[PDB]
Amino acid sequence: HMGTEDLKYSLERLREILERLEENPSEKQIVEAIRAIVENNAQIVEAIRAIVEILALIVENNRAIIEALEAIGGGTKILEEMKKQLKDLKRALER
Amino acid sequence: HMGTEDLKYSLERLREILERLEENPSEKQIVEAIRAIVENNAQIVEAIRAIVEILALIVENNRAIIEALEAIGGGTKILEEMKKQLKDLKRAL
Amino acid sequence: HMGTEDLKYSLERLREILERLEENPSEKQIVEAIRAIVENNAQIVEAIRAIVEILALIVENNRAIIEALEAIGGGTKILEEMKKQLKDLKRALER
């Protein structure tokens, strides 16, 4: 559940409120548009959090993949490179 | 990065618009600032959806990698882990 | 991680500003909300840039992985698919 549907929904409601604001500006409509922006930003944060969670799972999957390759046995150099890349991916996500 | 430069540009434009709004908060300038915010957020939604598509492509690539490892290395404990991880990834996307 | 905590808090600050905006939708409160929206967006852009970079690193890691598989098992039909997938991923990251 990446939540892209509700992210899109929140953008469309914001667009509708913007059109009404453009046609008949007022304090009421400015507040309504800012409230819609906040709701759209809320869905953006949720989508970003869900993405970051998937990234962590992918990196864990690659960790297991690289362990399988080590077990099979292979070139020293390529294994060292893959491990270093994995190390940097872990660091990036832990930052 | 992919479209990051466009997002960076749109952000700098918002900062410029904000500075003009701060010294001239007219109704018209407020509406134009809000217009720019929406246009920027539309770009963000687009970039997020593009990221999600790449995540699906990565996960399909890892599915193939794990199949390749099964054919070469056989049935291992580590193979069991990879399949479980992959199943969760496919379910979560 | 990856700034998600800062994004969540930034959203909370926006909501609090919106509460006071609804209380008195003066120009000062409107500009305060818009200034906070821009600051929040700056963090969103930064989070998306960090995400895109991790994506490229993961593709780089998968490229090394497939390099290792070819060195271990030689040419295979699954290797053909994986290299076409990599190229498509590399193309997606440019566009």
In angstroms, the separation between the Cα of residue A1 and the nearest Cα of chain C is 18
Of A49, A86, A95, the CB nearest to C61: A86
Both tokens of C92, joined, read: 């997606």
In angstroms, the separation between the Cα of residue A30 and the nearest Cα of chain B is 8
Contact between C72 and A69 under an 8 Å Cβ cutoff? The reply is yes
Rounded CA gap, A55 and C57, in Å?
Answer: 11
Contact between B78 and A60 under an 8 Å Cβ cutoff? The reply is no
Instruction: Determine the 3-state secondary structure of B24 from DSSP.
Output: coil
b/e burial code for range A4-15 (CB count within 10 A of at least 16 → b): beebeebbeebe
Q: Mark yes or no for CB contact B35/A14 under 8 Å.
A: no
Give me the amino acid identity at B16: E
The kind and range of the H/E element at B76 are none
Rounded CA gap, A57 and B39, in Å?
Answer: 32
Experimental method reported for this structure: X-ray
φ/ψ region of A74 (left if φ > 0, alpha if ψ in -120 to 50, else beta) reads beta
Both tokens of C13, joined, read: 């600050």
Of B27, B78, B93, the CB nearest to A67: B78
Q: How many domains does chain C have?
A: 1
DSSP character string of chain C: -TTHHHHHHHHHHHHHHHHHHHH---HHHHHHHHHHHHHHHHHHHHHHHHHHHHHHHHHHHHHHHHHHHHHHH-S-HHHHHHHHHHHHHHHHHH-
Resolution in A: 1.9
Closest by CA position to C90, among listed B50, B54, B46, B53: B54
Give me the amino acid identity at A92: A
Q: Mark yes or no for CB contact C62/B64 under 8 Å.
A: no
Residue C43: domain span: 4-94
Give the distance between the most distant pair of CA atoms in chain B: 70
CB atoms within 10 A of CB C80: 10
Contact between C22 and B18 under an 8 Å Cβ cutoff? The reply is no
Give Cβ neighbours of residue C69 (< 8 Å, ≥ 6 apart): A69, B65, B68, B69, B72, C79, C82
Q: Mark yes or no for CB contact B54/C95 under 8 Å.
A: no
Contact between B45 and A44 under an 8 Å Cβ cutoff? The reply is yes
